[PDB]
RNA sequence: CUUCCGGGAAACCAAAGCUUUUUGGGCUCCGGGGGAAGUAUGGUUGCAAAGCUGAAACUUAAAGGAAUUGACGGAAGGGCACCACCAGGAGUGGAGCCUGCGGCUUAAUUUGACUCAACACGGGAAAACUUACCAGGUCGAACAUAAGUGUGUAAGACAGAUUGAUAGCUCUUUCUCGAAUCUAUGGGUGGUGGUGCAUGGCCGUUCUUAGUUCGUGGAGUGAUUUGUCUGGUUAAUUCCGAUAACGAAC
RNA sequence: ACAAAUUGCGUCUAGCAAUAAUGAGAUUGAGCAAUAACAGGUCUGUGAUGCCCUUAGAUGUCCUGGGCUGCACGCGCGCUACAAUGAAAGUAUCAACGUGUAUUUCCUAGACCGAGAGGUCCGGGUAAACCGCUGAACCACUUUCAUGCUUGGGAUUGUGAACUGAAACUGUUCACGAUGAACUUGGAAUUCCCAGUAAGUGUGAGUCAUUAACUCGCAUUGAUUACGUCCCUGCCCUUUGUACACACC
């Protein structure tokens, strides 16, 4: 039961849902705005599990007297080379969840993973070594040979077991109890992956379809075709 | 046992009795005349208004039925 | 000034940037939770005031930085209303009396309520009843057990005591419908008994108001903002209109 | 007023103007009320209730009493005053909201008697139909008064006569003829309110065996003054400040 075929709402989506893309990373190749999770539904949804990573409440200061809304973390990350993080503020841990799920699905990126010596087997690590920062905490991803886990705290292990990533070693400066600035972090640690020009990246493409060019027939016609 | 605050245990010993049962055992004192004649110890009601059942009180000069502990007095008094 | 299309916890900074991913143009001075304490003591300089050097015992879990949201709470600028004045009018506060609350006392003077938002309130205008308080009284209520057996286990009145009234409630002496076997024992039962600071409910005021919120965006690491505003006008978040989602929602 | 109502157009839109109507210059007050809240109030409104307490010896319960009313005192709501605009006598002669008895003593018409208080006798009425055309009060009209704590003012205490009810005693209330105090416009402080309103003036209902002296509604008589402003206590997310937690107590 799905019960709701989705809406096309964008041109993109409305082609997944009329099947001219069929490749998740077309719209990573040309950078697009993924802005609907019924996108990634249709690619994955198999082997996309959710973890939350606190439920962190937050307060306001009301005249009489305090409000509480809840910034709930969540994190999926499809279990090889796809990441996402999610953040949300409700009146109600429910209509956190049930919604910083959407969120982390909209910002779902592509990991790359590389050999750390010796290029045999399924590239694992991490091909360089990647900080990212968000707010005076910056891990300091590095790779590590076949064999030794993620070895981390519990929570950025959390998004690295999920990423595809297998044999990482961290290491994390600053306020490491903000786990806001932690998830966040390593999430722009991870991400920034396929964003570091290495020697191996620079014979270049034929250079682009640019998916509105490759099917400008089907957004020319108004008429919602099926399936 | 209750609880309160100001005034307790004015105690009037709350000695109620039940019943004494220091006297008024049931008739078995009785006596019959052998063939046949029967002699009835606390004669019967004179009252028609009852079946002459109820063993009428021998006392000092006021008796009384058994319907009827308070009234049926044995004074006698007279009707004219 | 404008911006990073650089950094930062941010406020910000054309350096507070190139401090990159464990980074490197030389060089020097300085910091290591807060106090104790720039104190104590020694050296040294000064006429002196004082300056430079400079601890620890002890104490302690926070102290601190920057920013958000709380005061259209003694700060500006707005905008309302007679539980605001002003221009008054009538008033009470004075007098006697009815009440209300206290305090007093009493056997008890049952009590809840104490700024607006307790006070001719609790609809609380009570001789009894109410009545919760005070004195005298009075009533009894469950069962399996159980032990009289039905040689009366009971229950009722006279009569003289006890009474406030006949309460055979109790009883001197009397007859009696006798059985729910009237049980010490399960323990449920009532309660105007306690906690409104354990609660439901309603109601009160916060607030005569005009004020709140949500998905979707861009704002931030984030708390949170934006929408929900400059102005004009309105009784008004009522509308033009800047129109930073709106079609919104109360 | 069912508002293109015209009006040297305000940011072309919400330029007051009173001007137009001639039942109508709103006929015009109420109810209604969001989010977040308070250790507000209510366990004594409830068979709403956690828990606590108690139960033949009750805090439960019915009875007889008592009290809740008692007093050197303090405080608030509110009553009639402190008088010639008045207190008396007379006459004239306007309401409205309402309410009223068949498992409870209501509304009372009529006659009659009684200083009165009331009482008797006989009706109406379950109510647009009877009480009831409720023919309300203050005020209007001649007089007595001659400001003199007076005839203003009726607390105060005796006495009997009464009513309602088992029962009236800092009293259930009510009648008469006595008793005439404080009180002469009330200090600092201080409440209320803008048109039929304020205030004066009654009446009904609510509780109620009888008891308003209070609370809700009703009508009558009917003004002064503002038509504003933010000094005042005010209150509303605009800006800004902070070292403020339970937030300037």
Redesign the pocket.
């Known amino acids: 039961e799905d019960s709701k075929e989705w809406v096309p709402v964008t041109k993109l989506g409305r082609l997944v849902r009329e099947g001219k893309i069929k490749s998740l990373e077309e719209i990573y190749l040309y950078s697009l705005?993924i802005?609907e999770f019924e996108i990634i539904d249709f690619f994955l949804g198999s082997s996309l599990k959710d973890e939350v990573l606190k439920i962190m409440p937050?307060?306001?200061?009301?005249?009489?007297?305090?409000?509480?809304?809840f910034?709930a973390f969540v994190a999926i990350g499809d279990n090889n080379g796809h990441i996402g993080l999610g953040?949300?503020?409700?009146?109600e841990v429910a209509?956190a969840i049930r919604?910083a799920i959407?969120?982390a699905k909209?910002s779902v990126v592509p990991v790359r993973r590389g050999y750390w010596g010796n290029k045999i087997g399924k590239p694992h690590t991490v091909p360089?070594?990647?900080?990212g920062?968000?707010?005076?905490?910056?891990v300091?991803?590095?790779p590590a040979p076949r064999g030794t886990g993620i070895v981390s705290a519990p929570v950025p292990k959390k998004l690295l077991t999920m990423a595809g990533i297998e044999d990482c070693?961290?290491?994390a400066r600053?306020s490491t109890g903000?786990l806001?600035?932690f998830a966040?972090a390593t999430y722009a640690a991870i991400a920034?992956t396929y964003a570091?020009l290495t020697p191996d990246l620079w014979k270049e493409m034929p250079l682009g379809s640019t998916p509105y060019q490759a099917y400008s027939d089907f957004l020319s016609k108004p008429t919602p075709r099926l399936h | 046992?209750?609880?309160?605050?100001?005034?307790?245990?004015?105690?009037?010993?709350?000695?109620?009795?039940?019943?004494?049962?220091?006297?008024?055992?049931?008739?078995?004192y009785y006596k019959v005349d052998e063939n046949g004649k029967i002699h009835r110890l606390?004669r019967e009601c004179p009252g028609e208004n009852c079946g002459a059942?109820?063993?009428?009180?021998?006392?000092?000069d006021?008796?009384?039925?058994?319907?009827?502990?308070?009234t049926f007095?044995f004074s006698k008094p007279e009707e004219k």
Do not use: D, W
């Not at chain 1, 360089?128 to 900080?131: L, S």
């Not at chain 1, 920062?133 to 910056?138: E, M, N, T």
């Not at chain 2, 006021?62 to 308070?70: A, D, F, Q, T």
């Open positions: 705005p802005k937050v307060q306001k200061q009301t005249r009489a007297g305090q409000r509480t809304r910034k953040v949300k503020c409700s009146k209509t919604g959407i969120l909209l360089c070594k990647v900080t920062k968000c707010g005076s905490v910056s300091r991803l590095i070693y961290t290491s600053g903000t806001g600035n966040k920034k570091y | 046992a209750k609880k309160r605050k100001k005034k307790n245990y004015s105690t009037p010993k709350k000695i109620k009795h039940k019943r004494k049962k220091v006297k008024l055992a049931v008739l078995k606390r059942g109820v063993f009428m009180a021998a006392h000092e006021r008796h009384y039925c058994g319907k009827c502990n308070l007095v």
